[PDB]
Symmetry: D4
Subunit: 163 residues, 8 copies
C-alpha cells in the first residue's frame, strides 16, 4: 500500500518527540529508499497541524516555504529546505490542542441534534459575494485546552482571563 | 440563496467575540451540513480584514497558509489547517479600525468634489513600467482610529506622537 | 499615458510621509475614478522596496498577502486587504537605504572597468544544477547606509560593530 | 558551462561573509553582464538553506517574497526586491548547522545497513490519504550542532537542556 | 438581497440555455449591483462541470484562464476575460452526462453494501474469470451516457464499440 | 516619457493590425528604452481580450504561458516567450466582438431601469410562457456579433441556427 | 485499511482498462470511505503519465485543471472536476510507450559504463562523421515505440520516416 | 564537472535534432549524474522557445504542465512528466523563426537611431498616408520568416497574403 509507512511513522515520532537527529535519519532513509521529498513535505504539513498547532502558528509557513523552494529551485535544494523544516518542527514547542479540539467539535456536529442558530447570532455577513455563542443546550462547551507551550502560554492566559 | 448563511454568521460572531470553542462548533456544523471548507476559508480572509485588521497584521498570512495546506495536501488536512486558522483569529487581538477607515474614505471619494491633486504631491513615480497630504478643503481629515489592542497599541502611540 | 499618475503620486507621497488617512483618500480616489486595485497593489510592492526596505523586511509579505486575498476571494475583499496594506506601509518605519544602495551598485557596475573576480572569491558553488570582498581597486566601497529606524537600528549596530 | 560562475561565487562569499556592499556589487556585475535576476534568486534560496539555515528561519520567506515581486510586478522592481533579499541574507545571523546535519544524515543512510524501524516507532500515521528514536545500533547519534547565533541560541539551549 | 441570488440564477440559466446575449446582460447587472467578479468566476467553473462537461473538456481551461487574467492583471481586465468565458460557455456544446454519472455513482456507493474489491483488482491479487471491473452485484452497470454533442460524439462512438 | 507610452501604442496598433514584424520592432524598442517585459505582458493579455477574443480563445493561454515562463525561468527566457506571444497575437484571427458585446451590455445595465428577474429565472421560480431570458423590455436584444474569422466562423453558424 | 489501497488499485485498473463507469464507482467508494480527493488527484496525474502518455498529451492538462478547480473553488467542485478527469482518462487512447521508454533509458544509464559525450555534442566541440546522437556503443538504440493510438498515430508515422 | 554541461548540451542537441531516444538517454545520464530535474525543466522551456517556436505553440504548455506535475506531485512523477515533455519536444515540428526574428529586431533597436513613433501610431495622434507600422526608414522590414512546418504552414500562407 505505502512502502514508506513505517519510515514516515518513525519520522513523525521523532519530530513529535523533539528529536531532530533521529528525524533527519528517518528522512534520509526515506529518500535513499526512493521516497519522494513531497511525500514527506505533505506529511510535514500534517505534523504542523497535528503536533505543533497554535504553540507555533508560523510552523505551517516554514513548511510551505520549504515546499516552495522545491517547486522553484528543484529537487536537491528542495531536499535541503525540507530538512530545515524537519529540524524547525522538531525543536518547535508542541501542542496537539487545536488538533483534538477540532476532532471533538466535528464528532459532536455529526452526532448531536442539528440545533437552530440562536437568533442573536444571525445576520453577521461579510464583503464576499457583493460589496453564549453555542446553542443553549451546549452552553459552556469547551473543545480547546491550550497548553503552556510556545504561543499557547499567552493564549491560555487570555482565554482563562476572559473565562 | 446561501444555505449556510446563518451558520457562517454564527461562526463570524464567535470569532469576533473571541469564542474559539463556539467557532469550532459552527465550523463543524457547516462541514457536516455539506458546506465547503473553502467557502469558510474565503470568509476567514474577510474576517481577518474586517475584525482583526492591523491589530495583528500576520493574521491574513495564517489564513492564507491554511488555504495553501488545503490546496497542496488535500481536503482533510485542509479542514484541520482551517480549524487552526479559526482558533488563531478567535484568540487574536481585534480591531475594526482599518475596515471602517477604508469604508469612510471610499464613501467620501464617491460623494465629495473631485479635487485636483495638490501640485506638491505630483511626480512621485515608481520603478514599475520602466526602470498636509489632503486637498486643502479636506485638511485634518481622519479616517483611521487605531485601538489599544495588539500592534495597534504601538501604531496609535506613533500616530498620536506625530499628530 | 496613465490617467492615474497624479493620484498614485499623491498616494505614494502620503505613504512615504506616514500619512495613512491621506493615503486611504488617494487610494479611494483611484478606485472611484475607475482605477484597478492591482494597479495600486503593484505600486505598493514598489513602495515596500523603495521607501520601507530593510527597516521592515516583513512589509513585502503584507503587501503580497493583500494581493493574494484579491486573487482568492475577489475584488471587494481584495480592496479591503489592499487598504490594510496601505495603512501598514504608512505607519511602518521608513528607509530608502536598500533602494539607494542598489542603484549605486548598479550604476558602478555599468560604468567602472570589468575587474576580474579575485581568485580567493572563486569556487563557492551551491546545490543548484546538480547535488576584502571587492576587487582591490574598490576596497572599502560602501553603498548601504542603514538608518536608525525599525530593524535597521540593529543592522546598523551590527555593520558598524564589524566595520 | 555557466558564464556567471565566478561572479555568483563572489556574491555567495560576500553574503556568507556578511558583506552587503560587496554582495550588491557582484549582484550588479551579474545583471550588467546579462545575467538573469532569477538565476541569482535561485542561488539566494540555496544560500538561505546552506549558510543561514535555522539561525533565521524567516530568511527563506524573504527570498521567496522577493521572487514573488519579480513574478507579479516585473523585472525592474524584481531586481530591487532581490537586492533587498541580498542585503537581508548578508546581515542575517549565519549557521551552516542544518546544512551539514542533513548532508551527514544522508551519507549515513546511503552507507549504513538498512536497519528495521524499531517496533515502538511504528504506526504514527497522519490525516493524509484519508480522514531512543534511532535504531539501537545508532543510539546517541548526533548530526545537528546548533550555533550560538540568531534563533540557534535558544535552540541550542533547548536541545542541550533536554539532552 | 434575494434579488441578488436571482441575478446569479438568471445568469446560470442563460448560459445553460445557450443564450450568450442574455448571459452578458445578467452578468452586467450582477456587476452594477456590486457583485464580485470572482464570485461569478467560481460559478462559471461549476457550470463548466455541470452543464458542459466532456462535450468540451477545454471549457474548464477557458474559465481558469479568465481567472488567471483577473489574478495577474487586475479587476477590469479580469471582468472582460470573464465576459469572454461567459460567451464561450454560452455557445459551447452542452452535456450534463459527466455530472449525472458522478452523482449516480455516489448514490450507489452510499446506498448499496460496501462490496469487496474483486480479488484480481486488489493491490495484491488473491485467488478468485477476473474480467469484471464492477463487483459481481454491479455487473454491466452504466452511469455515463455521453451525448451526441461536441467531443462526446466521438466518445459515444468509442464507448459503444467497447460496449 | 510621453515618448514611452507612444512605443506601447505603436506595439498595440501593430499587433492589432496583424503586423508581426513591426510589433517585434516596437517591443525591442520598448525593451531598449528600459521598459519592463511584464508591463508588456499585461498589455498582451488586454489585447487577447480586446482584439482577438473568441476568434481564438487559446490566445489567452499563449500569453499566460509566456508569463509563466518569465515567472519560473527568468527575465531573458521570459522576454523570448513574450516575443513568441507577440507574434502569435499578431498573426491570430482578429475579433472585437466579445469586447464590444460586453461593453454594450454594461451600458444597458447602467442606463436602463433595474428590471426584475423574470419569475421563471429566479432562484425560487414564482407564478408568471417563461421562454424569455431577457426582461420583456429587452426581448430579442443582441450584443454579441461573431465575426467570420477563426473559431467565430463556427460560432456564427451556430448562433444563426439558434437565431 | 489494506482495503483502502485496494479501492485505489481498483480505480487505477478501471481507468487503465478504459472502464469509465467502474472507475466512477471506485472513486465514489473511495470518497465514502473518507479518502481525500487530492490523494486521488495525485494518482490521476501518475496515470496520465504512465497509461496515456503521448497518445493524448492534453491529458496532463485536464487533470491539472481539475486540481486547479479544487484549489480555487473548493472540495465539492473539486470532486466533480476530478470525476470529469476520471472519465476523460478512462475514455482517452492509452499508451504506455513514453513510460517504458524512460524506464529503459534509465536502466541503461545505470547499468552501462558512463560513456563520454561524443565530441561534436559537447558544449565546446572537440576534434572527432559526427552524425551520431548516441555514444558509438549505443548506436541505433530505440527506447520509444509509439502506439497506433491517438496522437501517436502521427508520431509513429513521422518516426518511421526519420527511422 | 565540465562533463556535466556536456550532458546538457547532448540533451539539447538530441531534442533539436528530433532524436527522442538519444534525448531520453542523455536525460537519464543527467539524472544518474545527480542533475536536478528542474534544472532540466528550465532548459526545456528555452528549447520550446528557441527550437520549436510557433511550429507548435502548445509546446510551451506541455513543458509547463510537466513542471506543474513536479511541483504538485513530487520529484519522481515530475521526472516522468519531464521525460514525456522531452519526447514531445523531440518529435515536434521544429522552427527557429520566432527566435531569430526577435534577435534581429533587438539588434536593430540597439544599432539604428531611436526613430520617432510615426505620428498616427502615437497615444495621441498628431498631424502627419498613415498606413506604415515601421518608421519610414524601416519600411517593409521583415524579421519573421515562418517555416513550412507545423502551425507555421498556415501562418506562412496567411503572411504571404498580407505580404
Amino acid at each position: 500500500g505505502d512502502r514508506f509507512y513505517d519510515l514516515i511513522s518513525a519520522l513523525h515520532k521523532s519530530v513529535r518527540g523533539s528529536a531532530p537527529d533521529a528525524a533527519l535519519y528517518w528522512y534520509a532513509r526515506i529518500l535513499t529508499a526512493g521516497g519522494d521529498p513531497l511525500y514527506v513535505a505533505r506529511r510535514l504539513l500534517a505534523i504542523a497541524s497535528e503536533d505543533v498547532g497554535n504553540a507555533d502558528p508560523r510552523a505551517m509557513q516554514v513548511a510551505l516555504a520549504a515546499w516552495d523552494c522545491f517547486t522553484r529551485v528543484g529537487a536537491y535544494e528542495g531536499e535541503r529546505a525540507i530538512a530545515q523544516a524537519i529540524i524547525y518542527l522538531s525543536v518547535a514547542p508542541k501542542s496537539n490542542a487545536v488538533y483534538t479540539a477540532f476532532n471533538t467539535a466535528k464528532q459532536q456536529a455529526k452526532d448531536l441534534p442539528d440545533y437552530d442558530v440562536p437568533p442573536h447570532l444571525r445576520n453577521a455577513p461579510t464583503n464576499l459575494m457583493k460589496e453564549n455563542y453555542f446553542p443553549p443546550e451546549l452552553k459552556d462547551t469547551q473543545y480547546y485546552f491550550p497548553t503552556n507551550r510556545g504561543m499557547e502560554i499567552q493564549i491560555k492566559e487570555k482565554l482563562e482571563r476572559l473565562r
